[PDB]
From a paper:
[name], an HDO from the opportunistic pathogen [name], catalyzes the excision of an oxime carbon in the biosynthesis of the copper-containing antibiotic fluopsin C. We show that [name] is a dioxygenase that catalyzes a four-electron oxidation. [name] is a homodimer in each structure. In contrast to quintessential HDOs, our data indicate that [name] employs a mononuclear iron cofactor to catalyze a four-electron oxidation.
This coordination is reminiscent of the 2-His-1-Glu/Asp facial triad in non-heme iron α-ketoglutarate (α-KG)-dependent enzymes but exhibits meridional geometry. V278 and R281, which replace the terminal two residues of the conserved metal-binding motif in other HDOs, are part of a loop that disrupts the α3 helix. A second iron is absent and the α2 helix is unfolded near the active site. A flexible α3 helix was also reported for UndA, BesC, and SznF;11,12,16,24 however, assembly of the metallocofactor is sufficient for folding of the α3 helix in SznF,24 whereas α3 folding in [name] requires binding of both mononuclear iron and substrate.
Residue numbers in the entry:
A (entry chain B): 2 to 326
B (entry chain A): 1 to 118, 122 to 327
The structure:
Amino acid sequence: NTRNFSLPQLQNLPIEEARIVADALAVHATSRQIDSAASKLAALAEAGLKGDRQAYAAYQQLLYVLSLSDDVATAQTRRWLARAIYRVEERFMPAADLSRALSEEDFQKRLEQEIAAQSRERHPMSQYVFSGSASRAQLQVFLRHQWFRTFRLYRDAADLLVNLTDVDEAAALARYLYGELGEEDEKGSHPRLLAKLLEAIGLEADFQAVSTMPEEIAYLNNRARAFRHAEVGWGLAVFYITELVVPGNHEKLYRALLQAGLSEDQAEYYKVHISLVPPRAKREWQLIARRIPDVQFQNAFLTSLSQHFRVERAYYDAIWEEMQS
Amino acid sequence: MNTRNFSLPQLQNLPIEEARIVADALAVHATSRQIDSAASKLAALAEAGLKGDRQAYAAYQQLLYVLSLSDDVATAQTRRWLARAIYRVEERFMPAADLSRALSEEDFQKRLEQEIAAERHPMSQYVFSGSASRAQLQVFLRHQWFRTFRLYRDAADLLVNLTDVDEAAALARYLYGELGEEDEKGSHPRLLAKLLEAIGLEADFQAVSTMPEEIAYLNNRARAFRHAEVGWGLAVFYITELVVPGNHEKLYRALLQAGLSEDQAEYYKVHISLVPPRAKREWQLIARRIPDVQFQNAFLTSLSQHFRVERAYYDAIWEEMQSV
Ligand SMILES: [Fe+2]
Ligand SMILES: [Fe+2]
Ligand SMILES: [K+]
Ligand SMILES: [K+]
Ligand SMILES: [Mg+2]
């Protein structure tokens, strides 16, 4: 129950920057140790994003420990250090760079255009599991990685809730979280429903799971960054693409599981996501509609969307390679 | 406008040197020097105020109020960073529970009840008796607004620090109820706004308190709910929500006697539970942590400190109520 705590993960990293981060997380750490960690981390991320493959792997691993470890005693300082890395990352990302706000029509047109080109539904990994062609072993590979995406999604959504100062917008995210965490029954939380499916196909569902897939780490790192961003356009973009527009995959996966011999109860995880409302008829769309006139929101939202698609594609490509190797 | 509870406007209107240092540290481009300078000056100011300097006390509590409870999210992470520098000083001075070994679950539940027993406040007896004028009820409800209107945000900070999925689920159920279930017009802040309108008061979602004891109460409650040792936050959650049915039932009855309709007083009615606190699912948040002595000491320390700031606040409300 400390396997996903910061110190045990840092001690498994031979790099000197991991020792410096450990010092900044100590109980008696001062501003000197914390600032020293922040400077070394920023330099490491800079070197990796400029093309140093070793620095790149190291900074992504350290950002994963900083942003997603479960020892709350170190969380405030860990997120402080993560922001030093995020500032470097956002410098390197291609940016929307609009000078004036798109019209509401033009904004929605751009949104629709990008989703068509990049939807997770068109990826070989998705259609292959859609088609019913996956073996049980390949379904296990798919679902081991679905675990990492699902099991702490609600925590990222809670970070956006904390950043929504308007009481009615906070209410919208609380309704989302209530559904995600099982309404009146904790055993129906969507992490626990997925745990039930994993156990049905002979996998363990580890709530202290730590990924060793580089593309998965990058995906989870990005998702946490976006949902925590003080400019909520970043988090709303990932929330929109991953919750307001994905009831279609889960219907195709639910059907595929029932064909593979799974019961409706064991496949409940995908069933409970099947939905009927278009994205703009969802009450959460108002949070985006409200902000469309502000070009700063438009730039953050569109930049977030494109970066999400890039890391999602690399991740899904890597799962596919694992399924075919 | 509705951005006057942002941090920079408030700091600009505070004519003391520490306010300029803090404002410079909140800029997105602030350097480590600027942030560390503010943290040092705030910690020194808090220590002076805690040791009997009345001007420093008023100054640090006002700065902590701006840091911890302003609504501009652009500065929130650094604001909370600086707030912690003050919290570390405050907690040094607080009388602390000193259990050397953890109590049993049944012994711990009995011990926290003894803290509650240690209400009978003259204001509570006066209001519950039906003796208050509508002008006096206005005094009480003006301050109820400050306690209620952003309570959900403090509970959300506790949710963030509850790593177990089932414990997060319990707080999400609380937040769902607190924010109106399927209908945001029924969120508990908006239910209270309806009651305030009924009695003749405005309900301002950008309200800023000027009562020192109320500021101290809200500052403490945010600190406790945000603490990385969640014994602090679960202690105040136990008080502010799990064991308020009796108080809110008596207030509900008093407001009906004052001529409010059931609908107008819905805010209080929805808090009247049908079972005692141990029979609620939220109790498992506390029962699961009881074998941990650090949890127990933080929980008891937080209870006592919460009751100290609550009593000073209730005394000050009562003084205001008697003056009308
Ligand atoms: Fe879900
Ligand atoms: Fe409530
Ligand atoms: K910084
Ligand atoms: K925060
Ligand atoms: Mg009557």
